[PDB]
Structure formats: C-alpha cells, structure tokens
Design a protein around this ligand. Structure first.
Ligand SMILES: [Cl-]
Ligand SMILES: [Cl-]
Ligand code: NA
Ligand code: NA
Lengths: 270, 270
C-alpha cells in the first residue's frame, strides 16, 4: 500500500479541504500515504499531477476537479482501476466517476427561494457564466418567466473577499433594483456577501436573502447562519475511496451502494 | 525544478491550509509542483513523509509541524539545504528553522485580557497541558499571583466542535465560578466556544471574553468578530519558501530579512 494523490482546485476552499481530509483518514487507515495538489483550475497543473501516475510515483489518484476530461480519459485508459473522479460534474470513460445531482439541488434551492416570495435574483458563479448549476438557474428563470438581469450576474467569484465586493455592490443599489435573493454557489462567497450587506444596514434575509452552497464547517457558525445546499462530504469521500481501493485490488466489491444526496439546509440567511 | 512536499498537522485547520497555499503559489511560480501531507501529529506519518526525501521522490520539504526533532535533524543533515522548518516552535540543526515569538504574543494577549479587568482564566490547548504558549500562560498567572484553576484548563481541544463542548460546559457554570476570559489557542476553537456561550445566553464579551489565535480567514466574519493573535501567514510562507529555494540553489542570498511579527488583533469577542 503506497502513495495516492488527490487533486483539488483550491485547498483553502473548506469543502475541498474537508473532502481531502475524509479521503485521507480512510486511506491512511488502509496503509496509504495521501498527498493533495491544487490546480487553481490550470490545466497544466492537472497534466503535471497526472504525470506522477504515468511515471508510477503514485499508485492511484482521486480527482475532485477536472479541467481536460479527454486527457484524464487517456490516463485512465492506460492505468485502469487507478483513476477515480468524484463530484467534478463529469463522467470520464476509463475512470470510475461519481456525479452528484447538482442540477436538481440547484433547481430545488431556487424553488425554495421563489416560494419565499423572491422574484429578482442575483446569480454568482466561480465560472464565467457564458455547468449543471448555471443551466439549472437558467431553466428556473425560464420556468417562472422571470427576466434574467445581466447586472445581477457575477462570474469568477470564489472567495469571501470577492463576495464582500459583490455584497458591497448589491448594498449600493436603490431598493427597487436590488435583488430579493442571491444564489452564491459557495459558502465562502456567502459569508463575504452577507458581511458587506450587514455593514451597509441591509437586512438579511428580510431585504436580501443569501443562499450558500456546500454546508461548510463555518456555515452554522456564520453571523447569519447559512441557508445552504449540503454536500455529503463523508459519504462521497467514502464512495471515492472504495472505488479506488477496489480498482487497486485492495477491496472486494460490495452490493450496498451509497446514493449520494445533496440536501437543502435551512437556517437563517434565507 | 521538481517536487516539494509540505507537512502539516491538519489540512482542515485554515491556518495550515493558508500557509500551504501561500507557499504553493510562490513555488508554483518558480516551476515546482507542491504537495501537502497531514500527520494528525502521528510521528509515523512524519517518518513516512521524510522517506520521500530520503528516496528522492522530493527535491525538498517544508515542515510546519514537527513531532520528532531528532529524526528531522538526521534527515536535514543527510540532505543539506533541502529541509526547512517553519513556525513549529523548534530549531532543528541542519535545517533552516524559522521560529515566531509565540511566548511573547501569548504574554501580550494575556496582559491585554488582565488589563480589561479579567481575573479568572480558562486556558485551552491542542496539547496535553502537562510549549511556548503554555509556559507564557503559567508565567502570566504567576506574575499576577493568580491561582490556576485546574477545572478551567482544557487540553486536546483542536476543532470548532470540541470548542462547542467547552463552551457548553463553561455556559453551564454558576456565574461565580465561570471564567472571565477564555484563551482558546485557535480561532476554530473560539468560534465553537462562542457559539455555545451565545446559545446559552452568556454574553460575549461582557460575561465571558474569548481570545482566538491565528487570525484565520473566518475571524473577522464570525458571529462575534474575533479578537485574536494574528499569524503573518504570507510573510512566513515567503520566508520559508526563500530559505528552501536558497538551499536548493535556485535563489541568491538576500540582505533584507523579514522580522516575522505576531500581532494582537482587537475586534469584538474580547
Ligand atoms: Cl458532480
Ligand atoms: Cl514558532
Ligand atoms: Na424580501
Ligand atoms: Na466580564
């Protein structure tokens, strides 16, 4: 039982740090040494990480972020059983790939908000908005015949500091053009957004409701405890770990599969 | 420019995740691939990590936690220039070692609290209390002829969940045996402690003041924004990175040294 690599976009994202930790503690118990690499979504960093498998510095890898699916596919084909992909919004041929239902969770979270009476929506993403979650948002807006306001779309927003800038801009707006609710796609971003709203005496949720994503460790402890979409970190980590161990010939196949569920966690911020 | 390893106790501690990130972004710019391993303070995990250098899977290592100084010393002696130690409360012969002034910072933070009128102190540590910070606490209590209450000492407390248990216990106490202030040694622990105090209607800071440690990213965003000791993550990461690069022959010596300073950050929780 040798070395395993885990690839994530950003280690300072507490969702990725938690996911790594859960994988690592279980693999460590099986005798493996586990190391994490971060990409900041650079495909060259992903390529370089994959060379560690190709050169057999690593016995296996678990990817939680994927930049170039076809490159991952080629490595998985050369190294069957040794590449697992988890919660990356993609199925990679040759690699056991676990996809969670982010489209459904996003539609459900948006339905929730609409049901609280919210009609003007800001949407924040880590990607450039021009993507299961973004399609869920667009589908949602179409279904309720709500006009998408481009002024309330925010792309490439990943951190709490970036969320602070978004919140400061939203707090600046006249009450009649201010969104009713903000879909942040990140508990980090949500904490920042909310902090800026409160600094400007914008009430949360009564003036602007803010929906998080992930249910990160800080979420229940936030100044306005976060309403958010809970990612089942422990369960997905266990599933990914088992798929890799099975592929490495360490573990037997099991009958009982997890169904990995995202769930809406209602607290105070929305 | 090859592979570098970074060793930390726990990746889900946002101080270690930040420290890694700052080191990694700078090394990445220099052409290195950087990977993090966590020990959970297990000396066998440290040993195993060091074998990656001994076998030259890695070109160099940066340790932010150390379990067995004499083993680290032996590796550093065999691999001169390739082992750097940062903020681990220890100088390792053979390894460039950067020690920050935690004794002074702790004494200063405690002096602050005493100056706010606090006289009954709870002290929380990640270690078993039977350690620059613990000695600072004992020195402090001796200097003010304050009797150390064993009932208000809490060891092996690392996480927000563990801090919640501590806070729930403190909130349970009769006002006359309740501490005036809690020195938590961790912003994670502080968030948990404070959350439990507030759940029990114990006012923070007016009933119990809570001092954090690290000035983690969540600190200013906490329900009661944290008064804490700020670790200079970016500066220490830069210093450690430069020492490793110099040792690897990539960088020239510089005249201008950082003096790495810990500073007391006053917000609301104390
Ligand atoms: Cl997914
Ligand atoms: Cl130190
Ligand atoms: Na409203
Ligand atoms: Na008091």
């Amino acid at each position: 039982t040798g070395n395993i690599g885990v690839l994530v976009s950003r280690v300072t994202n507490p969702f990725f740090a938690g996911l790594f930790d859960a994988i690592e503690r279980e693999l460590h118990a099986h005798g493996y040494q586990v190391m994490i690499t971060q990409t900041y979504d650079d495909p060259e960093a992903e390529e370089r990480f994959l060379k560690q498998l190709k050169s057999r510095e690593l016995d296996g890898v678990i990817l939680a972020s994927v930049e170039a699916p076809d490159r991952v596919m080629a490595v998985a084909k050369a190294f069957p059983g040794r590449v697992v992909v988890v919660n990356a919004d993609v199925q990679i041929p040759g690699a056991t790939s676990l996809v969670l239902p982010h489209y459904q969770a996003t539609r459900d979270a948006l339905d929730y908000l609409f049901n609280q009476g919210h009609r003007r929506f800001a949407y924040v993403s880590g990607g450039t908005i021009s993507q299961s979650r973004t399609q869920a948002f667009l589908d949602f807006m179409q279904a309720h015949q709500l006009l998408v306001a481009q002024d309330l779309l925010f792309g490439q927003i990943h951190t709490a500091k970036e969320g602070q800038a978004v919140g400061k801009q939203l707090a600046s707006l006249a009450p009649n053009v201010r969104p009713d609710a903000v879909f942040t796609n990140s508990d980090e971003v949500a904490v920042g957004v909310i902090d800026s709203l409160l600094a400007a005496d914008v009430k949360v949720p009564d003036d602007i409701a803010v929906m998080g994503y992930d249910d990160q460790p800080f979420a229940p402890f936030a100044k306005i405890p976060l309403t958010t979409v809970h990612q089942p970190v422990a369960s997905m980590a266990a599933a990914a770990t088992h798929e890799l161990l099975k592929g490495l010939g360490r573990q037997v196949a099991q009958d009982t599969q997890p169904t990995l569920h995202l769930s809406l966690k209602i607290r105070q911020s929305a």
